[PDB]
Amino acid sequence: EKIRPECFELLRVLGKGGYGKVFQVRKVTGANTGKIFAMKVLKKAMIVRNAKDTAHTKAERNILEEVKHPFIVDLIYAFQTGGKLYLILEYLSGGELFMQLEREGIFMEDTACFYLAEISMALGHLHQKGIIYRDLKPENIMLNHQGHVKLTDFGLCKESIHDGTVTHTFCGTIEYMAPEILMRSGHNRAVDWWSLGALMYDMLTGAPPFTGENRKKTIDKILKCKLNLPPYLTQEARDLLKKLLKRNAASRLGAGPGDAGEVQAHPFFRHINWEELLARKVEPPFKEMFRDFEYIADW
Numbered sequence: 001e002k003i004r005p006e007c008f009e010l011l012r013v014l015g016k017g018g019y020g021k022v023f024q025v026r027k028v029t030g031a032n033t034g035k036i037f038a039m040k041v042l043k044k045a046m047i048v049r050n051a052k053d054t055a056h057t058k059a060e061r062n063i064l065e066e067v068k069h070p071f072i073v074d075l076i077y078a079f080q081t082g083g084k085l086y087l088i089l090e091y092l093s094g095g096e097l098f099m100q101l102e103r104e105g106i107f108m109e110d111t112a113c114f115y116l117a118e119i120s121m122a123l124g125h126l127h128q129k130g131i132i133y134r135d136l137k138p139e140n141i142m143l144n145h146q147g148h149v150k151l152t153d154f155g156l157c158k159e160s161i162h163d164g165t166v167t168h169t170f171c172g173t174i175e176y177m178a179p180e181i182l183m184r185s186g187h188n189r190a191v192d193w194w195s196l197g198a199l200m201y202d203m204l205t206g207a208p209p210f211t212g213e214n215r216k217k218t219i220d221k222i223l224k225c226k227l228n229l230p231p232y233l234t235q236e237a238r239d240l241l242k243k244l245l246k247r248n249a250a251s252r253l254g255a256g257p258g259d260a261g262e263v264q265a266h267p268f269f270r271h272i273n274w275e276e277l278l279a280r281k282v283e284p285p286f287k288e289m290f291r292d293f294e295y296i297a298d299w
């Protein structure tokens with residue numbers, strides 16, 4: 001086929017994991033010459049032998065293509081070789097939202113709000129398509145050139161060191177995970193709303209709501225779920241967090257049949273013009289067998 005590995009110059013490694021790597025790359029051939037993409041390359045070997053890893057990989061692929069959205073990373077090309085799979089996604093030059101909080105320490109509510117709003121929309125869309133994002137750590141969120149939010153990660157675990165064997169649910173940080181996920185006791189889209197809460201808190205205070213002095217101590221905190229709000233938070237922020245961070249998933253705001261709408265309604269968001277926001281016209285605060293794998297965009 002017309003698209004092949006040799007169509008992209010390798011600029012540098014963005015990530016190394018067990019399932020493969022990510023590169024910053026430049027396109028050599030004519031289609032979008034000299035344009036920058038991110039190449040995700042997976043080891044067919046690691047994957048085909050495992051039915052789970054395989055299905056997860058096919059789902060990642062379907063999703064990045066069946067699902068076009070302004071706050072969801074765009075897939076540009078996909079293709080395979082012998083023993084490798086290739087996803088060419090837009091390069092997100094603004095880095096992780098993580099990095100932003102890192103240097104900021106704390107966001108101003110306005111800044112916090114903007115991000116959470118975009119992310120809220122992205123979540124509403126996925127939920128609509130029966131998709132649950134699952135882990136909303138500040139690293140699953142990235143920013144394009146224009147400082148807008150993009151949802152990143154639907155694929156295989158990115159670690160080289162995993163949590164145990166069997167599963168990759170807990171391989172990275174658990175700070176932003178809903179309690180039910182920690183008990184493996186069921187779950188659904190409500191878990192995302194928890195996570196949004198945990199994100200909001202971290203943004204507004206500079207630490208996740210239940211950081212313990214270690215991972216185990218951290219876990220125990222999440223299950224206890226004794227929520228302490230700092231006195232500096234506006235009553236809205238206070239209220240929203242009180243409703244997102246509920247142990248009982250059923251009562252969690254947005255857990256209901258109103259989903260994202262329930263959350264987007266909240267007074268914490270009075271200054272968001274959703275229509276404008278989705279149109280990305282809103283000043284941002286910063287900046288076996290893999291048969292029909294082969295793919296080229298538009299669409």
Ligand SMILES: CCc1cncnc1N1CCN(Cc2nc3cc(C(F)(F)F)ccc3[nH]2)CC1
Pocket residue numbers: 014015016017018019020021022038040041042073089090091092093152155156157158159
């Ligand atoms: C792909 C979207 C993106 C766009 N623009 C710039 N940066 C990006 N990323 C996406 C997030 N990413 C973290 C990461 N994911 C990985 C997945 C693997 C895997 F091969 F799947 F095992 C290995 C290492 C990985 N490191 C690095 C930078």
Ligand SMILES: [Zn+2]
Pocket residue numbers: 157158159161162163167168171
């Ligand atoms: Zn893992």
